[PDB]
């Protein structure tokens, strides 16, 4: 079942990336319309797909980033990130 | 008779610069300008420039004055007109072209050689994927990602040339070249035939026999 | 710097009948000095006109030119079956540069014929490369003119198929065209029924070639 | 083999994303300093792997992108890029 993985495989867990730009709503929509989610940062923080997963949206909205965020994060709507669907 | 003749068919990489010789034959070399003119597969035939093959002075159009260079040789009697720098658009066949005027003047062209295909592109050669077209029943080939042309597609070493169409290339967006070559059969003819597309890309030498099969299930 | 516009589109009239075609200048061409050449698919240009009127050696008696100003005019009596190409009129009046104009088709004039349609799934030896490409054939058709739109679940698809036409064909003198819907295999089998739907002057009501993902 | 890839398996070969940016030569030392090759352009230009490749190293030099480069008409051929290692 890894090889119908045509993206990042993790324990079981099939992350498809989407090299398309969209807002946090809109790739959660994007994301539920093929049956996935957003990746979650606490999943990924220290593991090797971190470096695939970089400036790309989570599932708190806040996008996933190598450190914890720098405590001035203000408004995350309105911007297009990519995102992958697992 | 007057000849004028190019080792043409030159796909290069943008960035590069590509030189199309003409050897021309039949009349006084030193007596009249050889003109070059540039045909685009969506713009039409635009005058280029000129040469004087008894001065070496050169008189070039706007969009191509120093971006282009023409030289030539008394001794093998040759006008070279060289494009530096190339880039995506300058894709195009390049005529040479003898006018019939003398000297420093302008008038109808004359004699015209054949022309110089030049596809400018950053691809790389890639041999071809053939994917079957299943089954007046028809069935054909998709050739897919391949680069550069020509590929030559044959069906059955080139038995049946009825009903066959081999469509001209399609460039896509990765930059890769594609086609489809399909023919029209009798449906009498599904079971006791098996159908060959024999596919031959010459840059890349890849020859494939794909067997078009009638769908199964 | 006068511009060479070819009012003809495509000249289409059957063999021998009478072809007319229209080269007009910008501005005034000094001393009449215009061109006509005749270029055969994948040939050089031939010379056929000089000083508006006056024929090359070795060029049938049926070509014809004439105008002035800004209106010249090339004719052909009869249609000969090499006169099927394209034509160009050049100016060399006011020149630098000699410019030349944009070229008219000659086609040729034959009865309405249908479009036979074939729509064709990829095969499976492409549903594993992680593409998709599903292609519709039209076969033997006249006019060109034909308007080919994919339905995926009859939804119209925009910006996802290429389009091919080939030459005249040398026995019935119709066209041939291919259209190829080219998506992801994720796309493919997230959804069932795949449609080709096919306008055209030959038929009555627009023809559905479908299948289902099977 | 594929779970003890932690990267992209595709045919058979694992490619290793590297997030640091180094020139061509750098990249190619650290490919070959870990047993493995930039990726072939070709083997993964018609694949779902470009979205991971983008504008990252290529085994002949020239990076990997989706279209067709239109003008290069730049000499100095010096950029840092992403690389993966095979």
């Known amino acids: 079942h890894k090889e119908s993985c045509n993206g990042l495989y993790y324990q079981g867990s099939c992350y498809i990336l989407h090299s398309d730009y969209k807002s946090f709503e809109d790739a959660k929509a994007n994301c539920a319309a093929e049956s996935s989610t957003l990746p979650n940062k606490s999943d990924v923080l220290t593991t090797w797909l971190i470096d695939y997963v970089e400036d790309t949206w989570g599932s708190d909205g806040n996008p996933i980033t190598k450190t914890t965020s720098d405590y001035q994060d203000s408004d995350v709507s309105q911007e297009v990130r990519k995102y992958f669907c697992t | 008779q007057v000849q004028l003749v190019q080792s043409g068919a030159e796909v290069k990489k943008p960035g590069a610069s590509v030189k199309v010789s003409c050897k021309a034959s039949?009349?006084?070399?030193?007596?009249?300008?050889i003109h070059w003119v540039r045909q685009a597969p969506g713009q039409g035939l635009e005058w280029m420039g000129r040469?004087?093959?008894?001065?070496?002075?050169?008189n070039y159009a706007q969009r191509f004055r120093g971006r282009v260079t023409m030289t030539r040789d008394t001794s093998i009697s040759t006008a070279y007109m060289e494009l530096s720098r190339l880039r995506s658009d300058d894709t195009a066949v390049f005529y040479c072209?003898?006018?019939?005027?003398?000297?420093?003047?302008?008038?109808?062209?004359?004699?015209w050689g054949q022309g110089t295909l030049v596809t400018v592109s950053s691809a790389s050669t890639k041999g071809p994927s053939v994917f079957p077209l299943a089954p007046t029943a028809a069935l054909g080939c998709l050739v897919k990602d391949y680069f550069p042309e020509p590929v030559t597609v044959s069906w059955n070493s080139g038995a049946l040339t009825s009903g066959v169409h081999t469509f001209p290339a399609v460039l896509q967006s990765s930059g890769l070249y594609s086609l489809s070559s399909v023919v029209t059969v009798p449906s009498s003819s599904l079971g006791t035939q098996t159908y060959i597309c024999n596919v031959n890309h010459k840059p890349s030498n890849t020859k494939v026999d794909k067997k078009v099969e009638p769908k199964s299930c | 710097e006068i511009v060479l516009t070819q009012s003809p589109g495509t000249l289409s009239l059957s063999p021998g009948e009478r072809a007319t075609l229209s080269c007009r200048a910008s501005?005034?061409?000094?001393?009449?000095?215009l061109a006509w050449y005749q270029r055969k698919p994948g040939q050089a240009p031939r010379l056929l006109i000089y000083?508006?009127?006056s024929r090359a050696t070795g060029i049938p008696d049926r070509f014809s030119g004439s105008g002035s100003g800004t209106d010249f005019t090339l004719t052909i009596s009869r249609l000969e079956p090499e006169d099927f190409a394209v034509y160009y009129c050049?100016?060399?009046?006011?020149?630098?540069?000699?410019?030349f104009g944009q070229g008219t088709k000659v086609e040729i004039k034959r009865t309405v014929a249908a479009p036979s349609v074939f729509i064709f799934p990829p095969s499976d030896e492409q549903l594993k490369s992680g593409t998709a490409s599903v292609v519709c054939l039209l076969n033997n058709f006249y006019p060109r003119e034909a308007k080919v739109q994919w339905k995926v679940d009859n939804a119209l698809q925009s910006g996802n198929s290429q389009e091919s036409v080939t030459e005249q064909d040398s026995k019935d003198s119709t066209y041939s065209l291919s259209s190829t819907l080219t998506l992801s295999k994720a796309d493919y089998e997230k959804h069932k029924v795949y449609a080709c739907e096919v306008t055209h002057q030959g038929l009555s009501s627009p023809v559905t070639k479908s299948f289902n993902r099977g | 083999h594929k779970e003890s890839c932690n990267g992209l398996y595709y045919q058979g070969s694992c490619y290793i994303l590297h997030s640091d940016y180094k020139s061509f030569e750098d990249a190619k030392a650290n490919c070959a300093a870990e047993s493995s090759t930039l990726p072939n352009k070709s083997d993964v230009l018609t694949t779902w792997l470009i979205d991971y490749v983008e504008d990252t190293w290529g085994s002949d030099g020239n990076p990997i992108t989706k279209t067709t480069s239109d003008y290069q008409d730049s000499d100095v051929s010096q950029e840092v890029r992403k690389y993966f290692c095979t």
């Open positions: 072209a003898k006018i019939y005027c003398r000297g420093d003047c302008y008038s109808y062209f004359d004699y």
């Open positions: 039949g009349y006084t070399f030193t007596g009249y300008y």
């Open positions: 040469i004087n093959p008894n001065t070496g002075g050169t």
């Open positions: 501005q005034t061409v000094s001393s009449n000095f």
């Open positions: 000083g508006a009127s």
């Open positions: 050049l100016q060399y009046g006011n020149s630098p540069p000699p410019t």
